[PDB]
Design a protein around this nucleic acid. Structure first.
Ligand SMILES: NC[C@@H]1O[C@H](O[C@H]2[C@@H](O)[C@H](O[C@@H]3[C@@H](O)[C@H](N)C[C@H](N)[C@H]3O[C@H]3O[C@H](CO)[C@@H](O)[C@H](O)[C@H]3N)O[C@@H]2CO)[C@H](N)[C@@H](O)[C@@H]1O
Ligand SMILES: [Mg+2]
Ligand SMILES: [Mg+2]
Ligand SMILES: [Mg+2]
Ligand SMILES: [Mg+2]
Ligand SMILES: [Mg+2]
Ligand SMILES: [Mg+2]
Ligand SMILES: [Mg+2]
Ligand SMILES: [Mg+2]
Ligand SMILES: [Mg+2]
Ligand SMILES: [Mg+2]
Ligand SMILES: [Mg+2]
Ligand SMILES: [Mg+2]
Ligand SMILES: [Mg+2]
Ligand SMILES: [Mg+2]
Ligand SMILES: [Mg+2]
Ligand SMILES: [Mg+2]
Ligand SMILES: [Mg+2]
Ligand SMILES: [Mg+2]
Ligand SMILES: [Mg+2]
Ligand SMILES: [Mg+2]
Ligand SMILES: [Mg+2]
Ligand SMILES: [Mg+2]
Ligand SMILES: [Mg+2]
Ligand SMILES: [Mg+2]
Ligand SMILES: [Mg+2]
Ligand SMILES: [Mg+2]
Ligand SMILES: [Mg+2]
Ligand SMILES: [Mg+2]
Ligand SMILES: [Mg+2]
Ligand SMILES: [Mg+2]
Ligand SMILES: [Mg+2]
Ligand SMILES: [Mg+2]
Ligand SMILES: [Mg+2]
Ligand SMILES: [Mg+2]
Ligand SMILES: [Mg+2]
Ligand SMILES: [Mg+2]
Ligand SMILES: [Mg+2]
Ligand SMILES: [Mg+2]
Ligand SMILES: [Mg+2]
Ligand SMILES: [Mg+2]
Ligand SMILES: [Mg+2]
Ligand SMILES: [Mg+2]
Ligand SMILES: [Mg+2]
Ligand SMILES: [Mg+2]
Ligand SMILES: [Mg+2]
Ligand SMILES: [Mg+2]
Ligand SMILES: [Mg+2]
Ligand SMILES: [Mg+2]
Ligand SMILES: [Mg+2]
Ligand SMILES: [Mg+2]
Ligand SMILES: [Mg+2]
Ligand SMILES: [Mg+2]
Ligand SMILES: [Mg+2]
Ligand SMILES: [Mg+2]
Ligand SMILES: [Mg+2]
Ligand SMILES: [Mg+2]
Ligand SMILES: [Mg+2]
Ligand SMILES: [Mg+2]
Ligand SMILES: [Mg+2]
Ligand SMILES: [Mg+2]
Ligand SMILES: [Mg+2]
Ligand SMILES: [Mg+2]
Ligand SMILES: [Mg+2]
Ligand SMILES: [Mg+2]
Ligand SMILES: [Mg+2]
Ligand SMILES: [Mg+2]
Ligand SMILES: [Mg+2]
Ligand SMILES: [Mg+2]
Ligand SMILES: [Mg+2]
Ligand SMILES: [Mg+2]
Ligand SMILES: [Mg+2]
Ligand SMILES: [Mg+2]
Ligand SMILES: [Mg+2]
Ligand SMILES: [Mg+2]
Ligand SMILES: [Mg+2]
Ligand SMILES: [Mg+2]
Ligand SMILES: [Mg+2]
Ligand SMILES: [Mg+2]
Ligand SMILES: [Mg+2]
Ligand SMILES: [Mg+2]
Ligand SMILES: [Mg+2]
Ligand SMILES: [Mg+2]
Ligand SMILES: [Mg+2]
Ligand SMILES: [Mg+2]
Ligand SMILES: [Mg+2]
Ligand SMILES: [Mg+2]
Ligand SMILES: [Mg+2]
Ligand SMILES: [Mg+2]
Ligand SMILES: [Mg+2]
Ligand SMILES: [Mg+2]
Ligand SMILES: [Mg+2]
Ligand SMILES: [Mg+2]
Ligand SMILES: [Mg+2]
Ligand SMILES: [Mg+2]
Ligand SMILES: [Mg+2]
Ligand SMILES: [Mg+2]
Ligand SMILES: [Mg+2]
Ligand SMILES: [Mg+2]
Ligand SMILES: [Mg+2]
Ligand SMILES: [Mg+2]
Ligand SMILES: [Mg+2]
Ligand SMILES: [Mg+2]
Ligand SMILES: [Mg+2]
Ligand SMILES: [Mg+2]
Ligand SMILES: [Mg+2]
Ligand SMILES: [Mg+2]
Ligand SMILES: [Mg+2]
Ligand SMILES: [Mg+2]
Ligand SMILES: [Mg+2]
Ligand SMILES: [Mg+2]
Ligand SMILES: [Mg+2]
Ligand SMILES: [Mg+2]
Ligand SMILES: [Mg+2]
Ligand SMILES: [Mg+2]
Ligand SMILES: [Mg+2]
Ligand SMILES: [Mg+2]
Ligand SMILES: [Mg+2]
Ligand SMILES: [Mg+2]
Ligand SMILES: [Mg+2]
Ligand SMILES: [Mg+2]
Ligand SMILES: [Mg+2]
Ligand SMILES: [Mg+2]
Ligand SMILES: [Mg+2]
Ligand SMILES: [Mg+2]
Ligand SMILES: [Mg+2]
Ligand SMILES: [Mg+2]
Ligand SMILES: [Mg+2]
Ligand SMILES: [Mg+2]
Ligand SMILES: [Mg+2]
Ligand SMILES: [Mg+2]
Ligand SMILES: [Mg+2]
Ligand SMILES: [Mg+2]
Ligand SMILES: [Mg+2]
Ligand SMILES: [Mg+2]
Ligand SMILES: [Mg+2]
Ligand SMILES: [Mg+2]
Ligand SMILES: [Mg+2]
Ligand SMILES: [Mg+2]
Ligand SMILES: [Mg+2]
Ligand SMILES: [Mg+2]
Ligand SMILES: [Mg+2]
Ligand SMILES: [Mg+2]
Ligand SMILES: [Mg+2]
Lengths: 272, 49
RNA sequence: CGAUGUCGGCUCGUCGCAUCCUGGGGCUGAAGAAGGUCCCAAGGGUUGGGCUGUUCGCCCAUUAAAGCGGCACGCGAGCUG
RNA sequence: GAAUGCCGGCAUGAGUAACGAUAAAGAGGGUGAGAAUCCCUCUCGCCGUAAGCCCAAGGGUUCCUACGCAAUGGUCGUCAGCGUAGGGUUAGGCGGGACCUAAGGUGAAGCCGAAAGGCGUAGCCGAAGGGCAGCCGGUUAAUAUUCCGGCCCUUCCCGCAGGUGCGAUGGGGGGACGCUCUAGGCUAGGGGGACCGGAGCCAUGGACGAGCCCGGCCAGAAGCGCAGGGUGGGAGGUAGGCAAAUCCGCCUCCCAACAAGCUCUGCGUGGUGGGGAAGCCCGUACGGGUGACAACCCCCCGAAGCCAGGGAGCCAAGAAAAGCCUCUAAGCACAACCUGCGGGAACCCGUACCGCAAACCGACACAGGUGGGCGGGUGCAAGAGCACUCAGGCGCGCGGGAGAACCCUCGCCAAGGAACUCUGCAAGUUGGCCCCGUAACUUCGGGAGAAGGGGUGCUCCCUGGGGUGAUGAGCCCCGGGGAGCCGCAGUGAACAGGCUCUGGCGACUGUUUACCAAAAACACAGCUCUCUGCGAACUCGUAAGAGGAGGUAUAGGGAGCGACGCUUGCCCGGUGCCGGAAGGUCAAGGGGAGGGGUGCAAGCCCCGAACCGAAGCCCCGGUGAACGGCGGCCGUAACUAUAACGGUCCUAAGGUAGCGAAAUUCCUUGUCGGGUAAGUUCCGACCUGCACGAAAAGCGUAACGACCGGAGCGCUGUCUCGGCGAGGGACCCGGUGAAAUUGAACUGGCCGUGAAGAUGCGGCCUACCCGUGGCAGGACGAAAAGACCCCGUGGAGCUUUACUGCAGCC
RNA sequence: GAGCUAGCCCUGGCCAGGGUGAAGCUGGGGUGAGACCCAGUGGAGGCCCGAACCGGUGGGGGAUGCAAACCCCUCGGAUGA
RNA sequence: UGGUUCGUGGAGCCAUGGGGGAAUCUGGGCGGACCACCGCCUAAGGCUAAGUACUCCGGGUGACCGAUAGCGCACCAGUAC
RNA sequence: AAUGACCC
RNA sequence: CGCGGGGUGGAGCAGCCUGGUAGCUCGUCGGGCUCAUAACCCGAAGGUCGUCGGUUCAAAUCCGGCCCCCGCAACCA
RNA sequence: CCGAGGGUAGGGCCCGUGACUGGGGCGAAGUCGUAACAAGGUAGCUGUACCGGAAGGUGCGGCUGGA
RNA sequence: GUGGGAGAGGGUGGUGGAAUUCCCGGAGUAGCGGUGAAAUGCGCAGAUACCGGGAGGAACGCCGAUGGCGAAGGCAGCCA
């Protein structure tokens, strides 16, 4: 839906906030299962190695369930859907009959009170997790494992999915959010449905501060700098570059493919 | 204005203390040099309890 | 070049005369009045504004006239910038 | 004898500048060898959201007392933060440690690295965070939540007494959390009182009066009362909580739905204890006595604090561990644990004084810098603002006269009102509140405090709401109406927008050259390109490892552009990148036709042609929000002028839209029109654009701006054009007393001359010896071994299709 | 050597008093149901005025200074990047 | 690749990171590419006095200093600052 | 695979 | 003032560097197609190569001096 | 008290004029092309959109006022 | 009102085949495209033509009419 504001201030005239109506009466989270201390820090042991990180709201990590094959066969009741500061998506709090409480990343269409479960069994319904094999060709799916028993790694961003395209002996072909065509092992779990919160892309930050709230420090142009700092630094009053556009570290930034050629992963990929 | 000396007993101790110098080869040599020199004070005297 | 601060303005001046005005004079194609033009003469005078950093210049309203030039393109241990 | 030489000593400027905020002083009396400067008293002035008080940091003896003044103090010094000596810092409850965990550090296992060393789950360390039992008074010259008094607590250990399955570093629960706005009831704190207590006081015209003045509090266990916080009770089933569990979790039934009940805080009250003014008298540097058997009561205002884990809303989604409760395991159930009650035990370190400052950071008793808490009263709409002022603390460690110039800070001014100047720079005008009243334009929010106005004091009368109170008096908040008084003037002082029109740039709040640039630069939401399938790309590291990310294409890196509106044309020839299992070239290696050296030979050893050989390059393509680029010359219409039209050369393609003498226009003050009396600026146009142009974006845009340009009104010392007054210096007297500079000096003008600008040489002219206040023209005056310029086979930063390497990638 | 300065990490603190009045809620109105429109409440915002506090805009002083960045007047921000 | 006078040189010897990879006296290395002859040595384990270097320290001597010299310090100096 | 000066 | 590129029939361009021959397109002229004009078709004409000088057997071409034309440069002060 | 009017301040409507600029009407024999009327030599006309000296072309849908 | 009838009337969800294009494998050569005629273009780096597999979007042939439905604009594979 997206919340919109009137221009009672500049920067309030474009600003735009998510709709939280799917956030069920459960705004503060769940101890026990999560949260952990989350360790803010824009850099490695010592030095900054990703520029322009820092500031922005304190967070608690929700330790979510990315391998659903523990509770094969054990169903769970979806108890709530809550805000997760550390991902684009929303998260489902679910209660297993087992007693155990996990969070699943919350797919589009998930309703509270719903039944959900994981395993070879598993009715093909939104919320359920299955090894890729038993899932019908052509159904859209998410939180897909890359290699079996290694955890969900594909399609967890808000409003993303992959579609099952066909099969090939032990592998089923996937079409990933990027549009790539991937052979992913049959035995990999993946949960049916799309991610949801799909209006995430429609949000307009609206002002500088908002950027900072999310811990995004000001990014400065190479043009703004000096020859010591950047290939684009200097010279006089503005300058068009004077070389093929580059990163600060000298590599070209328009076109230069960067995936290493001889990756053994290659023989499992069929697209862009 | 604000000058450059902003005394702190803990800082002076953690920074220039006998135990800091002892911790690394760089520092151990400092004690060696100061000893051979005949320095009355190997490290700065940080006070208080 | 072990430093002579460099435009313009301002402030204060002072000097040259190849005189802008005033005083004296010759010639005039000088009727008179007003001019032209040369010579004598610097004692005093030589306005206020619009534009531009401007010097200069062009305008506006005047004036007896709105002189030219030197003084480290006079003058920053005097000011401005 | 010179090196702007090195070290030291003493000169010159010079009794000169200064003596560190313009808050301010005067006198009388003491002490003393010596008083503007020390003590005391009286008067005056200054601070008072401090210039007062309480903590933290830092400092470390500066605290208190006695004796002292050589030095230290910008003067003096009998004084001191100074010299000499002596004294002073008392804790189970305050803070820190025999408690916990944060970032981070360290680090067993483990990983890595020529060595040194780098990492690293556990653990350990790490605190203004969590945990934790003290309040009110009295005493010292100097310490007290520490000593003492009163009242109140907490831990251990040993006993008895009564309970129960007790029992872990292990399970769960809890601890436990954002921002903004907030209700109810309280406390802190403050105002009023005809009420209560009190020494006293009638002045100078009047008042012996609900007269003036002073004070009417503090703590306090149990128990109560008032607020408020926490929380459901049962019974079964159970596969989860990494062994167990009665615990938690999930499910299913019953009873509550409530704070009803348990509790747990806060506030009142409480046995009791403590304090208790002015004034008056004293002898202290200061405190003492009395006032007192002090009284210790009623209203009102009232928090930002408390009840606290209260409530509502919002998006950016808000530490951990221990203590604590509960569950059980090994064990043990003569142990053990819980509750009550006795007795006993309760260590280590800090405690002085300064602490917005003369004791901390600034070489100084330096006008600068320094985190937290309290910060009273009156008014002005409010307030921590402003004026005065409690408490308290100061008059800033040189003074006395004088009343020139000139300077600083300040006040006023005839007439004129920007004529000043690069510029209204500066300075004035404006100014709070209430009420009228407000345009273009606009993104419908705005522009707006538009502009422009009027009201503002005090008195008396009438009258409307609330709050606390019983529905009432009072006390306290907001209003309305009518008469009336005074002055030049009523936010009568102090605090408190000058306004408008129109361009440029940037959308906007923000950021920046600490110490000459706050901007039109940077950032910014948003737009596009491109890389990246996840052991991601990328960054750091030799590696291990880590960041990215406990993320996963709506995500992450790189690039440019930079809200938004309308748009962003053409060229892929060159360069870059992307795509091409053909082809050409292509190194080590494979291959050996063939040849060479030695041997009597077997042999041993050398070169070495075909041919098989990667990436890279060549070649074939694509690709512009990739690096980039986007022409010339002649002719032509029935007045001239001009050229819709045409020819021709060249390119990879020849600039579209929209702008345009512009932050861009050389010629140039282009040419018309506008503002002016007059306008190289400004605005509107024209287009001959030296040399605009579409994401190094193009043309626009409401709002925004300590940005930059032009205009007008208002107002003025900016000016014509100055004048006067004020205080701080300047000046004279007493005390203290520098500096750069300095070859030596007995240091005049003119015209000359001289290395070409002479006090010093020539000729003349002038001129008695020496100071004080002033002005700066000269001493090519001081200051800095010129910044600019060249020089040096001097040096650095930076760039690239300069050379040559290296990392990195292939 | 990060006790100055730049950034980030952990844990705390601070921001008087006034304005303006977004959403939402509630009531009324409109419709077949709506959209929407009026009140009232509510209290949003890199919103406004203004102390602390953080700055450093213009001018003047200071220039062997009080100060190797100071002082006066004036000005920007002040719930947020 | 390093070492040696040896910088790729006709480049051996000695050491070694990578690849291949023997022999036990009729076995192996060397005598400067290489081959023949003639010789010299016995690799792939280790220890081993003395002659040699140094002067914190003690002594001796000086065509060495004599307090701006001589050590930074003749003096309570790696102190004060 | 273009064009047909003016008025009548 | 400096630099380096340029003047060829009526128009626009080649031809030069490796000296001897001046060629392309348009236009002009004559004829044809058409009722006529243009388009189209067939034939033809047309160039002191800016001037001055000589180098050569011979100069559009090579070399000097001037003259117009175009483009660049004019910086540190 | 009110009050003609004068003054100051800001709006509303209307008239005139303005460098320059936009298209329009009209004016016997100037320029360029051929769009339409015959299947006008690409059926035309149409709304919209883009492009072009100019008529105009093209895309998309539509109409018979064409076969 | 009761009881019936035809229909491409509308909205939502799902689904079928023919064909075009692109990708992959096979087999296969010297030209294919295109027009008034050509050229641009694609193709010896393996094109066009043919077979097998896959991806994907769009529009529904025959039925079909000079037909039906709707207020017009307009409505056409099938299913609910
Ligand atoms: N004529 C009215 C409107 O304007 C235009 O028409 C105007 C012009 O286009 C037209 O110009 C024509 C030209 O088209 C035609 N081919 C040649 C003719 N000589 C010109 O003629 C014009 O100029 C001449 C002299 O100058 C005048 O005398 C004559 O009256 C006038 N019509 O002249 C008209 C002025 O009267 C539109 N084409 C027309 O269709 C439109 O309706
Ligand atoms: Mg690191
Ligand atoms: Mg480290
Ligand atoms: Mg940027
Ligand atoms: Mg820069
Ligand atoms: Mg670089
Ligand atoms: Mg430039
Ligand atoms: Mg360029
Ligand atoms: Mg550049
Ligand atoms: Mg010089
Ligand atoms: Mg000199
Ligand atoms: Mg000098
Ligand atoms: Mg004369
Ligand atoms: Mg005469
Ligand atoms: Mg004169
Ligand atoms: Mg001017
Ligand atoms: Mg003169
Ligand atoms: Mg001159
Ligand atoms: Mg001059
Ligand atoms: Mg001069
Ligand atoms: Mg200047
Ligand atoms: Mg000498
Ligand atoms: Mg000396
Ligand atoms: Mg003197
Ligand atoms: Mg003097
Ligand atoms: Mg003096
Ligand atoms: Mg003083
Ligand atoms: Mg006062
Ligand atoms: Mg002492
Ligand atoms: Mg003392
Ligand atoms: Mg004494
Ligand atoms: Mg003294
Ligand atoms: Mg003392
Ligand atoms: Mg500890
Ligand atoms: Mg370590
Ligand atoms: Mg610990
Ligand atoms: Mg604590
Ligand atoms: Mg304690
Ligand atoms: Mg004390
Ligand atoms: Mg006690
Ligand atoms: Mg138990
Ligand atoms: Mg626990
Ligand atoms: Mg009397
Ligand atoms: Mg009272
Ligand atoms: Mg268990
Ligand atoms: Mg009480
Ligand atoms: Mg008493
Ligand atoms: Mg709450
Ligand atoms: Mg622990
Ligand atoms: Mg102990
Ligand atoms: Mg103490
Ligand atoms: Mg104390
Ligand atoms: Mg303070
Ligand atoms: Mg001070
Ligand atoms: Mg000090
Ligand atoms: Mg002092
Ligand atoms: Mg402060
Ligand atoms: Mg207060
Ligand atoms: Mg008040
Ligand atoms: Mg006020
Ligand atoms: Mg004040
Ligand atoms: Mg005046
Ligand atoms: Mg006057
Ligand atoms: Mg006036
Ligand atoms: Mg003027
Ligand atoms: Mg003037
Ligand atoms: Mg101006
Ligand atoms: Mg001003
Ligand atoms: Mg302006
Ligand atoms: Mg503006
Ligand atoms: Mg800006
Ligand atoms: Mg700053
Ligand atoms: Mg600066
Ligand atoms: Mg600014
Ligand atoms: Mg500045
Ligand atoms: Mg944009
Ligand atoms: Mg990692
Ligand atoms: Mg992570
Ligand atoms: Mg990005
Ligand atoms: Mg930019
Ligand atoms: Mg473009
Ligand atoms: Mg190109
Ligand atoms: Mg290219
Ligand atoms: Mg190409
Ligand atoms: Mg390539
Ligand atoms: Mg080879
Ligand atoms: Mg070989
Ligand atoms: Mg190759
Ligand atoms: Mg122009
Ligand atoms: Mg003009
Ligand atoms: Mg004019
Ligand atoms: Mg203009
Ligand atoms: Mg230009
Ligand atoms: Mg530009
Ligand atoms: Mg561009
Ligand atoms: Mg821009
Ligand atoms: Mg700003
Ligand atoms: Mg600004
Ligand atoms: Mg004056
Ligand atoms: Mg005066
Ligand atoms: Mg005075
Ligand atoms: Mg004196
Ligand atoms: Mg003399
Ligand atoms: Mg001379
Ligand atoms: Mg002499
Ligand atoms: Mg002389
Ligand atoms: Mg004198
Ligand atoms: Mg002088
Ligand atoms: Mg002077
Ligand atoms: Mg001088
Ligand atoms: Mg020099
Ligand atoms: Mg050289
Ligand atoms: Mg720091
Ligand atoms: Mg509302
Ligand atoms: Mg604000
Ligand atoms: Mg403010
Ligand atoms: Mg405060
Ligand atoms: Mg100044
Ligand atoms: Mg301010
Ligand atoms: Mg070698
Ligand atoms: Mg070597
Ligand atoms: Mg060599
Ligand atoms: Mg080896
Ligand atoms: Mg060997
Ligand atoms: Mg060998
Ligand atoms: Mg040998
Ligand atoms: Mg030999
Ligand atoms: Mg040998
Ligand atoms: Mg051996
Ligand atoms: Mg001697
Ligand atoms: Mg010595
Ligand atoms: Mg001696
Ligand atoms: Mg010495
Ligand atoms: Mg024609
Ligand atoms: Mg006629
Ligand atoms: Mg002919
Ligand atoms: Mg220069
Ligand atoms: Mg008009
Ligand atoms: Mg036609
Ligand atoms: Mg047609
Ligand atoms: Mg047509
Ligand atoms: Mg059309
Ligand atoms: Mg077209
Ligand atoms: Mg194929």
């Amino acid at each position: 839906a997206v919340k919109k504001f009137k221009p009672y201030t500049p920067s309030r005239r474009f600003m735009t906030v998510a709709d939280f109506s799917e956030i069920t009466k459960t705004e503060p989270e769940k101890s026990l299962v999560k949260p952990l201390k989350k360790t803010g820090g824009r850099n490695n042991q010592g030095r900054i190695t990703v520029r322009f990180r820092g500031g922005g709201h304190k967070r608690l990590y929700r330790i979510i369930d990315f391998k659903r094959w523990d509770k094969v066969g054990i169903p769970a009741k979806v108890a709530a859907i809550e805000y997760d500061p550390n991902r684009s998506a929303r998260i489902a709090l679910l209660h297993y009959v087992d007693g155990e409480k996990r969070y699943i990343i919350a797919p589009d269409g998930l309703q509270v009170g719903q039944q959900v479960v994981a395993g070879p069994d598993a009715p093909i319904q939104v919320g359920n997790a299955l090894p890729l094999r038993f899932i019908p060709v052509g159904t859209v799916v998410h939180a897909v494992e890359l290699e079996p028993k290694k955890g969900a790694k594909l399609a967890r961003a808000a409003g993303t999915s992959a579609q099952i395209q066909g099969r090939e002996g032990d592998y089923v072909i996937l079409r990933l959010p990027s549009g790539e065509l991937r052979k992913v092992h049959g035995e990999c779990y993946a949960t049916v449905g799309a991610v949801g919160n799909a209006d995430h892309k429609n949000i307009v930050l609206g002002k500088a501060g908002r950027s900072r709230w999310l811990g995004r420090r000001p990014h400065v142009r190479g043009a703004a700098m000096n020859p010591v700092d950047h290939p684009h630094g200097g010279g006089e009053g503005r300058a068009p570059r004077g070389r093929p556009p580059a990163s600060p570290w000298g590599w070209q930034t328009k076109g230069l493919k960067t995936r290493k050629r001889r990756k053994p992963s290659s023989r499992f990929i069929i697209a862009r | 204005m604000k000058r450059t000396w902003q005394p702190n007993r803990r800082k002076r101790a953690k920074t220039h203390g006998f135990r800091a110098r002892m911790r690394t080869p760089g520092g151990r040599k400092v004690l060696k040099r100061r000893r051979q020199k005949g320095r009355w004070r190997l490290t700065p005297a940080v006070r208080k309890r």
